[PDB]
Amino acid sequence: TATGDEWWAKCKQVDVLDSEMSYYDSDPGKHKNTVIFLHGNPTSSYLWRNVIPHVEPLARCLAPDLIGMGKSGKLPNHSYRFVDHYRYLSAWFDSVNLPEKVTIVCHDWGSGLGFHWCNEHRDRVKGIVHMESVVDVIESWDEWPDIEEDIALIKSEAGEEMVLKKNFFIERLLPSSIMRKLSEEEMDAYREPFVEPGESRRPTLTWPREIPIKGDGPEDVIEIVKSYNKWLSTSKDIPKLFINADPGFFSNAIKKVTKNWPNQKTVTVKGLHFLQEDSPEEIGEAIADFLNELT
Ligand SMILES: O=c1n(Cc2ccc(O)cc2)[nH]c2c(Cc3ccccc3)nc(-c3ccc(O)cc3)c[n+]12
């Protein structure tokens, strides 16, 4: 239904350091909860468009486009590592009138950014809802989807060609992990940030190169994931909602990683990796119920 123009015309923009980030912000009013939605690779705030209306009745809902993605600014040095994204997203957090306690709803690399933000601002966290999330370092490939060889390929010089020239993540990976078929308006919304070939597509390539593989990953990312995984593994006072996807992609592995995490509820919905496009109403209602139980 809702087109890219329709969605981004509901969004605001805010200067962030040298650049600017676009974001959805629900209409100002009286509200008891503030919920931030973080997408990952290769999507944008558009990914939450059908989830958010089920949470807005009870929360101010923010959804930023990460730097270089959606309608946020492109960085001239083309450097979009995890640590760069966190720099701009942290500044964004500081610029949108957040109350003292927020709930984070995150997905894919958005969960990596959000988990790290929560671990660094533990006093600001009311709750965490996560799905298909970066919950741990990948220490043995046998407990995870078998993408070892794909990651090796994407780290190779063939990565530049697959992504920058052929837009592999948008054109092949994205539709392959959505059970239904996206309308052309929906698929154009995901295309829009990356229509120009070359370095405009750089974030969708840098993101998989950051994947924290023990002994094979960037060590700044590994150290961050290890530290937020330790903290999460005993976060007794942080109510957590793991939305498990069936069949999912990482969902099976995440179930095993977090089986002994305290204060995590699990709700299951139908979907592959981009579960928001297959079960948005179930995902939004679960978040609504989760916030309702918080009070
Ligand atoms: O880093 C990657 N994350 C971040 C992440 C890590 C651990 C975790 O628990 C959660 C999230 N995710 C991916 C995905 C996921 C996906 C995207 C779209 C469709 C299907 C699957 N797929 C790849 C990849 C797949 C083929 C390739 O040829 C190259 C890369 C890489 N990552």
Closest to 198 (Cα-Cα) out of 164, 169, 172, 244: 164
129: left (phi over 0), alpha (psi -120 to 50) or beta: beta
Burial class (CB in 10 A: 0-12, 13-18, 19+), 41: buried
Mutate to test the pocket of ligand 1, among 85, 108, 134, 224 (most ligand atoms within 8 A of CB): 108
Please work out whether the CB of residue 150 comes within 6 Å of at least one atom of ligand 1: yes
* Number of domain units in the chain: 1
Residue nearest to atom 1 of ligand 1 (CA): 208
Closest to 112 (Cα-Cα) out of 8, 216, 227: 227
Residue nearest to atom 7 of ligand 1 (CA): 134
Half-sphere exposure for 5 (CA within 13 Å, toward CB): 1
- φ, ψ (nearest 5 deg) of residue 225: -60, -45
Only one residue has tokens 């760069």, namely: 84
Q: Please state, in angstroms and rounded to a whole number, the distance separating the CA atoms of residues 275 and 282.
A: 10
At 1, list the tokens: 């239904």
Helix/strand/coil for 47:
helix
At 258, list the tokens: 């977090």
Closest to 235 (Cα-Cα) out of 88, 118, 91: 118
Query: Is 261 tagged catalytic?
Result: no
Q: Please state, in angstroms and rounded to a whole number, the distance separating the CA atoms of residues 61 and 53.
A: 9
- Whether the ω angle into residue 197 lies within 30 degrees of 0, i.e. cis, is no
Contact 45, 37 (CB under 8 A): yes
Please work out whether the CB of residue 163 comes within 6 Å of at least one atom of ligand 1: no
Query: Is 78 tagged catalytic?
Result: no
Half-sphere exposure for 122 (CA within 13 Å, toward CB): 10
Only one residue has tokens 């992990």, namely: 177
Query: Is 41 tagged catalytic?
Result: yes
Tell me the CA–centroid distance for residue 134 and ligand 1, in Å.
10
Q: What order do you get walking across the sheet with 19-25 strand by strand? A: 11-16, 19-25, 60-64, 34-38, 102-108, 125-133, 240-247, 264-271
CATH number at residue 191: 3.40.50.1820
Contact 127, 103 (CB under 8 A): yes
Please work out whether the CB of residue 154 comes within 6 Å of at least one atom of ligand 1: yes
Catalytic residue among 65, 84, 132, 210: 132
Strands, E assignment, 85-187 = 102-108, 125-133
Q: What is the dihedral of CA 77, 81, 83, 86, to 10 degrees?
A: 90
Strands, E assignment, the chain = 11-16, 19-25, 34-38, 60-64, 102-108, 125-133, 240-247, 264-271
Query: Is 85 tagged catalytic?
Result: no
Query: Is 117 tagged catalytic?
Result: no
Which structural domain, as residue segments, surrounds residue 182? 4-294
